[PDB]
Amino acid sequence: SHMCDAFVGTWKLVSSENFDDYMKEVGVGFATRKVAGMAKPNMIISVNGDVITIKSESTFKNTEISFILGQEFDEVTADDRKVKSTITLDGGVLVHVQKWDGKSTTIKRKREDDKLVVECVMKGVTSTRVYERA
């Protein structure tokens, strides 16, 4: 048993708060915000050795990242940013920093009760996305 056991699984989005405003702060344009904001993604997390894979599947976009903790990688975000990402574990929280165009956003993912809570932060703006097991 191991580092991210409690994250592993298939998860479905059940609530979202302030996501439009988070996307605005990120720089997402109107049409992508409207369509992206409707999506109810399935997040599929798995671990094979040191490699963590997070897939997100929705009607808007399918994304996939695989990574080793602490080791920077290239990511294509759902809104089509090309970012440099680094994901670490801090006290049981996955902390994902994305850098692009001189900007930065942090996504934290944590287990809380039977949920997986995703907090997306851009400057002063937070969005909270709550997932339950599918």
Ligand X SMILES: O=C1C=C(O)C[C@@H](C=C2c3ccccc3-c3ccccc32)O1
Please report which helix (H) or strand (E) contains residue 107, including its range: strand 103-112
In angstroms, rounded to a whole number, what is the distance separating the alpha carbons of residues 29 and 11?
27
- Among 13, 45, 83, 116, which residue sits at the site for ligand X (rule: CB under 6 A)? 13
* Residue 129 assigned ligand-binding role: yes
**Binding segment toward ligand X, per CB under 6 A, in 45-53, 64-72, 77-85, 86-94:** 77-85
- Among 52, 75, 87, 129, which residue sits at the site for ligand X (rule: CB under 6 A)? 129
- CB nearer ligand X, residue 8 or residue 60: 60
In angstroms, rounded to a whole number, what is the distance separating the alpha carbons of residues 95 and 93?
6
- CB nearer ligand X, residue 1 or residue 101: 101
In angstroms, rounded to a whole number, what is the distance separating the alpha carbons of residues 102 and 117?
27
- Among 47, 69, 78, 93, which residue sits at the site for ligand X (rule: CB under 6 A)? 78
- Helix then strand then coil, % of the chain, to nearest 5: 15, 55, 30
Taking CB under 6 A as the rule, does residue 77 contact ligand X? yes
Taking CB under 6 A as the rule, does residue 45 contact ligand X? no
In angstroms, rounded to a whole number, what is the distance separating the alpha carbons of residues 70 and 30?
34
